Amino acid sequence: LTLKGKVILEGIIELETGMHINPVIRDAFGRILIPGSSLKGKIRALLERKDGLPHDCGECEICKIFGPHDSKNIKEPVRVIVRDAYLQPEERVVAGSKFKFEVVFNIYKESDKELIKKFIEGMKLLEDDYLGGSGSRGYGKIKFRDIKLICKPKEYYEGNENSKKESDEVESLNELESELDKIWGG
Amino acid sequence: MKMVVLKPKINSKFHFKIFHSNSLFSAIVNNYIKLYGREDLEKNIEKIKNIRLSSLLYKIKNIYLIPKPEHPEFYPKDIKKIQFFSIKAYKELLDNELDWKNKIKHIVDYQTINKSIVISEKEIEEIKRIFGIKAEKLKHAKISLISKHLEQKVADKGQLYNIEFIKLNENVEFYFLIDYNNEDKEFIKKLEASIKLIEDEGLGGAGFFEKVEIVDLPEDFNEILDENSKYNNLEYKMLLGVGIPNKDDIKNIEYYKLIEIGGYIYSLECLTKPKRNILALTEGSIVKNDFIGDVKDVYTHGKPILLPFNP
Ligand SMILES: [Zn+2]
């Protein structure tokens, strides 16, 4: 199963609420950041709760995206990688603070549009819940803002520089689904 | 022969001593498999295993760091701290425009960065320009090129171990030399694609990049590595990557250093089973005539790009 392309979802994460320092960590080098696996983890939790130890099998909506809990069960390669969200310049983090975030999508099949859409819908579920905490009482609300999509098709890595297309910045997740459709090369 | 330049992302940090060329090979191979499948690789394994690589070296704008030649000529006892030579400075050691023997104090006082990197006189002023150094001597200037930090992680019970994280300065980039040793365009483009995928794939562990670009060798490297030049007849050569010798190159090895390449400790089940390791010559080892190399077998690349050397 060859790789057809990468779809990077770059953007900004903003804090509506203050945050102490599981969700927000302070790097070994002193840098403030939100660990990618934390973010991705809460997205797993919500995206799995809205479908009725994370899920672990080959064929499934959630397990094709985030990958199964065990590596002995991978039928198809993992499609999503959530980069660590580092704090941008201009114990508790003040509200209004911005973390530049990046989400990498590995597209192998032409039906993985709905996987990306499922992840973005997960982000929408997280936008109106809480980053830190789980289940009954979460803490620190979060809002996604300024989101661009970048397409790096197989033809881009092979040498074609202009095959790399980039959508323009949208203010919310809801506007992504259109900008997603306006970008599909492979 | 082409140069690959990797510009690290802004808040990126790496986990890998330097990043050896066999790890680069494994990266370009996992990327080849990722782009073209596991089948199309073993239809070209005999042509990817015959590429020549250098290890992951450091680039400062137009200054290219190369390992220090492990020749005894380069031995108070402060000279045991240096590990790098700018390619220009290294070239000046060939044309005798730089005198190691009787001018070491001028080199150590006016031409060495962080007591570990020797450069040329013609690079001093731009080094001072970049990092805002006003000191008349470079001896009196500690430049923050990399930031190291060990961390205590576990493999919660099991084995405790340390992992060293490296952070690069905004003016510092990675680079490595690649020799395809071939001309099949349909293959070259897929090697360069596998190399270019690192941009979003990363190195180590992962540390990601903002741009991975394949360009032609800078003019020092090209004026040195061109086989239609003087240096071609130089009788010794220095490894720029790890070297895994075949039964024939063992008679060409003069001064060298050994390191052990190998595997993961996939369990505790294997704490009863022996640990077979692959011996290799470190970057900077000197060999006479020509070093061919080998690729053990998961692949372990040991064919290093050689760089003409004269004592
Ligand atoms: Zn599942």
**Do B64 and B90 belong together in one domain?**
no
Number of domains chain B is built from: 3
B267 contacts chain A (CB < 8 A): no
| Cβ atoms of residues B30 and B276 within 8 Å | no
Closest alpha carbon to B51 in B251, B282, B257, B241: B241
**Do B113 and B247 belong together in one domain?**
no
Residue B10 DSSP label? T
**Do B77 and B18 belong together in one domain?**
no
Q: Which residues contact B74 (CB under 8 A, 6 or more apart)?
A: B68, B82, B100
| A28 three-class SS | coil
Cα gap B233→B309, rounded to integer Å:
10
Residue A111 token pair = 């039906």
**Do B161 and B294 belong together in one domain?**
no
Helix (H) or strand (E) holding A25: strand A25-26
Domain boundary residue, one of B188, B206, B227: B227
Calculate Rg over the CA atoms of chain B.
Answer: 20
| Cβ atoms of residues B176 and B4 within 8 Å | yes
**Do B138 and B47 belong together in one domain?**
no
Partners of B208 on chain A (C-beta within 8 Å) are 83
For chain A, the domains span 1-186
| Residue-number span of the structural domain to which B103 is assigned | 70-169
- Going from the C-alpha of B162 to that of each of B153, B159, B165, the distances in angstroms are 6, 10, 10
**Do B153 and B180 belong together in one domain?**
no
Q: After which residue numbers is chain A interrupted with C–N beyond 2.5 angstroms?
A: 21, 52, 90
Which backbone phi and psi does B198 adopt, to 5 degrees? -55, -35
The whole-angstrom distance between A88's CA and the closest CA on chain B is 10
Domain boundary residue, one of B186, B201, B227: B227
Comparing alpha-carbon positions, the chain A residue that sits nearest to B164 is A28
- In DSSP terms, which residues pair with A96 in a beta bridge? none
**Do B187 and B62 belong together in one domain?**
yes
Residue B121 token pair = 């006189």
Rounded to the nearest 5 degrees, what angle is found at the Cα of B18, between the Cα atoms of B15 and B270? Answer: 65
Comparing alpha-carbon positions, the chain B residue that sits nearest to A105 is B200
Domain boundary residue, one of B227, B247, B275: B227
Q: Which of A2, A29, A33 lies at the smallest CB-CB distance from B149?
A: A29
Cα gap A121→A115, rounded to integer Å:
10
**Do B16 and B74 belong together in one domain?**
no
**Do B273 and B251 belong together in one domain?**
yes
Note the resolution in Å, 1 decimal. Answer: 3.1
Cα gap A99→B151, rounded to integer Å:
24
Q: Which of B35, B151, B196 lies at the smallest CB-CB distance from A2?
A: B35
Burial class of A160 by CB neighbour count within 10 A (0 to 12, 13 to 18, 19+)? exposed
What is the rounded (10 degree) CA torsion for B177, B181, B186, B190? -30
Give the Cβ contact number of residue A22 at 10 Å.
Answer: 12
Residue A124 DSSP label? H
- In DSSP terms, which residues pair with B52 in a beta bridge? B179
| Cβ atoms of residues A13 and A141 within 8 Å | no
B37 contacts chain A (CB < 8 A): yes
Burial class of A36 by CB neighbour count within 10 A (0 to 12, 13 to 18, 19+)? middle
Partners of B199 on chain A (C-beta within 8 Å) are 157
Question: At how many degrees (to 10) do helices A113-127 and A36-49 cross?
Answer: 100
Q: Which residues contact A172 (CB under 8 A, 6 or more apart)?
A: A144, A145, A147
Cα gap A168→A175, rounded to integer Å:
11
Residue A163 token pair = 């095959």
Rounded to the nearest 5 degrees, what angle is found at the Cα of B171, between the Cα atoms of B166 and B172? Answer: 40
